Amino acid sequence: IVQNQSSLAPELSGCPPMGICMDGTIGDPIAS
Amino acid sequence: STSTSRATYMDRFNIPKNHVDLIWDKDGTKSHTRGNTTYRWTERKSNVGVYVGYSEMYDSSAQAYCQSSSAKIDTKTTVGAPYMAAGACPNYGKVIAFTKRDGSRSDMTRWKNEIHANVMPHSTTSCASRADPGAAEVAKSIEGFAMYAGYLTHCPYNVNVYRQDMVTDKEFDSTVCNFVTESNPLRFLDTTQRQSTQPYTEYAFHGKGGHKGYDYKGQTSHVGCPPYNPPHVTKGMKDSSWITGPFECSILSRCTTHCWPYKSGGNCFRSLPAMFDMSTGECRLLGYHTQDFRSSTCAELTTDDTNAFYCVRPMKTAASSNMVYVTSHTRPDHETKCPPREPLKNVRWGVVSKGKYCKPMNARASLSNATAEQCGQRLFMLSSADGSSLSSQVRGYHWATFVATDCNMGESCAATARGKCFFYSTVPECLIHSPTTMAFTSLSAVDPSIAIDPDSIAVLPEDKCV
């Protein structure tokens, strides 16, 4: 699938879908 | 030499030569140093449409995303080709108005609402429930033209965005774009500034806040997850202070392309045009390149059909004279290559005659019993346009001289005076002073009450022997 890096980003983030985890902490921005 | 200095000054009014289609490239043959920075570009063509300006979408990212046949660009539907908004000169007074198909009942502030391009939420990964793209966006019936406030907590969200998309993009430059890098990202949700209410402070990639936009957060504490309850009132950029004029506003667009998501078949956002407000300093990115749409299928002011596009067209009014339509590819030398915001009071367009005199240009056409504002408006509407369909309307006129019946056009009567509009397609070389005239270009604002003098280097005595 063609997509740019910002499209792929939520699927790599440790805290999807926007980069803030359920507990209000953030990222590892690339967790996989 | 005054003659040389005059020619150098008058170059700023040569709209077909200077209102060009440029793209950024460090190997481009064109250059200009503005402040501490040398900008480099290629000029693909001249004479870009002023009323409506388009060129083919140019994507020099390594993946060339938005050049793909599967990339959706809003102009494919409305114009018939994948076009980006183009034209190197800032266009003063130009606003994208929402109208009926005949241009009536125009709304010149509707554009400030966000778009509904069926993008947000882009992902709902890990959320308790799913939602289709579009679910978080402002209702179609209130859709405007403004780009989404932001996407993810910051841009570049990860180092792959920066290193695989941004740095290897031939239009990107890390110095010009030093406010959207790995080490200095552009913040949407600034997690370095927590609050008692939430673990971040909300900003935006563009704008100064207060607008109707998509519900980025959703109703739950899991940020970004469904359900949504738009509209959400936007916040402003964390730091807009460096955006001091229309060219700086274009830089915000240039640098933020890769902040937006693209997946095959979806909208591909690149080289976005923008609105700059001279009075407030607000720079607002537009989500759509379309400048005119008036087909039988266009939606008149309100619709629920998310596959429809609204009837819109460019408009200038006296009241819109604080606004500037800015393309992503604005030339950094625009102050000396493009017309200024204000009409020119008490002068008439001319060409040099016998070395040290000026004779008026030869009118292509005239309009009788018009106001000065009408002169500027019709000049704009009769200037130039890309996209084919308006060719029967535009005439190639980029300069007009308004001659009031009996008003000094530097006095208070200027706003209501009637007179004659003379339209020209000849490049001007000088100006003639007159008490009862005002000079417009197709890129000028149209409020006669803000008119100012040209540089006196332009003005020569009239050759009255012609």
UniProtKB/TrEMBL annotation, chain A:
Q: List the disulfide bonds.
A: C15-C21
UniProt protein name:
Cytoadherence-linked asexual protein
The species this protein belongs to is Toxoplasma gondii (strain ATCC 50861 / VEG)
Task: Quote the range of the complete protein represented.
Answer: 1293 to 1324 of 1490
From TrEMBL, chain B:
Sites carrying sugar chains? N369
Top-rank taxon of the source lineage equals: Eukaryota
Intrachain disulfide bonds? C66-C268, C89-C338, C127-C225, C155-C259, C177-C255, C249-C283, C298-C311, C358-C430, C375-C421, C407-C413
Kindly list the places in or outside the cell where this protein is found, as annotated in its UniProt entry: Membrane
Q: Which family does it belong to?
A: Belongs to the apicomplexan parasites AMA1 family.
* Name of this protein: EGF family domain-containing protein
Organism annotation = Toxoplasma gondii (strain ATCC 50853 / GT1)
Question: Where the shown chain sits in the full protein?
Answer: 59 to 524 of 1148
